[PDB]
Design a protein around this ligand. Sequence first.
Ligand SMILES: CC(=O)N1c2ccccc2NC2=C(C(=O)CC(C)(C)C2)[C@@H]1c1ccc(OCc2ccccc2)c(Cl)c1
Length: 561
Amino acid sequence: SMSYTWTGALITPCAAEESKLPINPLSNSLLRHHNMVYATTSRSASLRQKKVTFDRLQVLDDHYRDVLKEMKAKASTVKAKLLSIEEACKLTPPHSAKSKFGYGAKDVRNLSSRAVNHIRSVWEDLLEDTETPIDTTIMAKSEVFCVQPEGRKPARLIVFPDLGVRVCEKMALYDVVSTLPQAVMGSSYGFQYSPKQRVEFLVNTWKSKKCPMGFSYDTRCFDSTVTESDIRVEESIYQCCDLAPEARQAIRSLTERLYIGGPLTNSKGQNCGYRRCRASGVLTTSCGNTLTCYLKATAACRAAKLQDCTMLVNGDDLVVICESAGTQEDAAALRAFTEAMTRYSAPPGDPPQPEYDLELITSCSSNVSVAHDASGKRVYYLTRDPTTPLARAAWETARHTPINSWLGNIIMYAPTLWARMILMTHFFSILLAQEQLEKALDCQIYGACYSIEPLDLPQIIERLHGLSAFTLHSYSPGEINRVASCLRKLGVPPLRTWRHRARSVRAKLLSQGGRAATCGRYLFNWAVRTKLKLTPIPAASQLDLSGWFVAGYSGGDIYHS
Ligand SMILES: CC(=O)N1c2ccccc2NC2=C(C(=O)CC(C)(C)C2)[C@@H]1c1ccc(OCc2ccccc2)c(Cl)c1
């Protein structure tokens, strides 16, 4: 069976799509090579459609079944609650795609009599109807990138059900999908970790091995490799939770009717094809992908007889650290592993490379690098090639986009050379210039959408990274060469120029006192020679990030207000 069948109807946009970076005074001071920056559109959808459509091979074995039972054993631990319509709506992001049935996200959030009635009827139909496939829209996602060294990416696709359904998924599954991965995978579940916690875990795992070997594994179009069996097995795990009767039935109907496959419709309302694999835009895609990657990966480790495997799983991204048996025997073990995964229907994009320095391993586009704090002590932190973040920064500088990936990157990659000298300097300079310092902004962390105030960045950074994040220096030469190389490529002024801009911006922040001066002091301490003494922020210890690093939610339509 094929991941997709198509009718021949086009994947259509519903608004004019922009694709080239505008020529803007502001984004041009960040990034001069504007023709290198682009956004994907509907126009490239048929290339993706080809790429994402293939037949699937899946043969299961005892290792797989053994691991499944063990996962289910842990699942059986879990009790899960139905959300009320109220809670479910409050998790709806304000600009979520409006229902086809005469109400939108703002009406859902207000608990408008119309929206809520529609939701209740959707819910009842979920209890009453087991079999009727639920409709989904398919859309070309618009993401921005930098052009490949030699050529472009075609748009990614997003498959989502009507708003009314999305709300009913939250009611049935929000507590499950955000409690159960932890219960099952334990320390292997990556979305439980803040940035410093992920680092502690990777370094500690690495340091705990007599002789560590590690690799990342990258299955191509993970979503299209997920089969109906996979999605049903994923359901068998959810059914181990203590569930209210209505949620048990709702998950069962949602599984047959939605998760397992269904019909696709384009913005024009046209039958477009049929999906027989994971939908990218539902509440369970993050969790399901995590359980599924975990289940197969664990089974494959056993298949390859890898020793003392520790893995970290976040949706489809997967990293394994384990005991090196020797170069030859590690190389042969990885290939065995890959062929095991391939049989479970998770073949690799590129074959995994056994790796013997932690810094060389890369997952979620990020690697571990070293720097030194104030005392000179070695500090590990997560970083990445900054090209895509930077190109997106230029884009978002020239366009009011609904999500500010620049804000997210500052939060997630705060200790990096490039986030501190470029993102902060650029964006605080702009925001100062436009009186926008106190204006809250949307970004998303691990899928979930958050409204954040720029002036709160120093406390958030403290909590997510520690004080260390404000004092790192003596980055690794390879990291500096990567960042420097990247700027030449993109036409971003050199780091030397950003220090000069930072010094200026820092002054202006200190001028303003209060929360703005806090930013100047902590965020830009790197910019001045006569550094200020930096101590814990009172407001950081205090305030509240309960929902931040609990679970993955990408595609799930989640907003934490
Ligand atoms: C699709 C998605 O939501 N993620 C994602 C996955 C894969 C590639 C690139 C990404 N992009 C981003 C993620 C964010 O949250 C926000 C940010 C604007 C950054 C972009 C998130 C992510 C990024 C890194 C991740 O691990 C590494 C890591 C973790 C913590 C601190 C630093 C680094 C994990 Cl698990 C998820």
